[PDB]
Write a protein that binds this ligand. Structure first.
Ligand SMILES: O=C(CO)NCc1c(Cl)cccc1Cl
Length: 123
């Protein structure tokens, strides 16, 4: 029921995305890059991603695991590092801080989920 609950990650991720939306550091990443306004973005970035898209994919039940959610969120950060590569850019620093925040908080979500999988597969 609650120990090793394989669905608990969904609400944990919803809560984490809420905190992320509150962070001033997420401001550049809350919505898709305006591709019609900044067309050179697609010359550099193959797969755009943003937190509004992640939040909707989760809400729609279209992540099979928190690892799938984590893959999309990491893509937000790898896309920022590719488009904005300079350590001097304040946007780089923003992305860096928010990535560290995300990775800190997602850690337990993943480890708990994977432990639950080990438990149910074992038994
Ligand atoms: O990568 C991002 C996410 O919003 N921002 C960099 C950016 C700037 Cl500062 C200005 C115009 C376009 C873009 Cl993509």
């Amino acid at each position: 029921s609650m120990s090793y609950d394989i669905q608990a990650w969904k609400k944990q991720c919803e809560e984490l995305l809420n905190l992320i939306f509150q962070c001033e550091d997420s401001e550049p990443f809350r919505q898709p890059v305006d591709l019609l306004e900044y067309p050179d973005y697609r010359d550099i970035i193959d797969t755009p991603m943003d937190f509004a898209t992640v939040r909707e994919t989760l809400e729609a039940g279209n992540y099979e695991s928190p690892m799938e959610l984590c893959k999309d969120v990491r893509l937000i950060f790898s896309n920022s590092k590719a488009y904005t590569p300079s350590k001097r850019s304040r946007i780089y620093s923003m992305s860096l801080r928010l990535s560290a925040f995300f990775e800190e908080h997602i850690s337990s979500v993943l480890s708990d989920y994977k432990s639950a999988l080990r438990f149910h597969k074992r038994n």
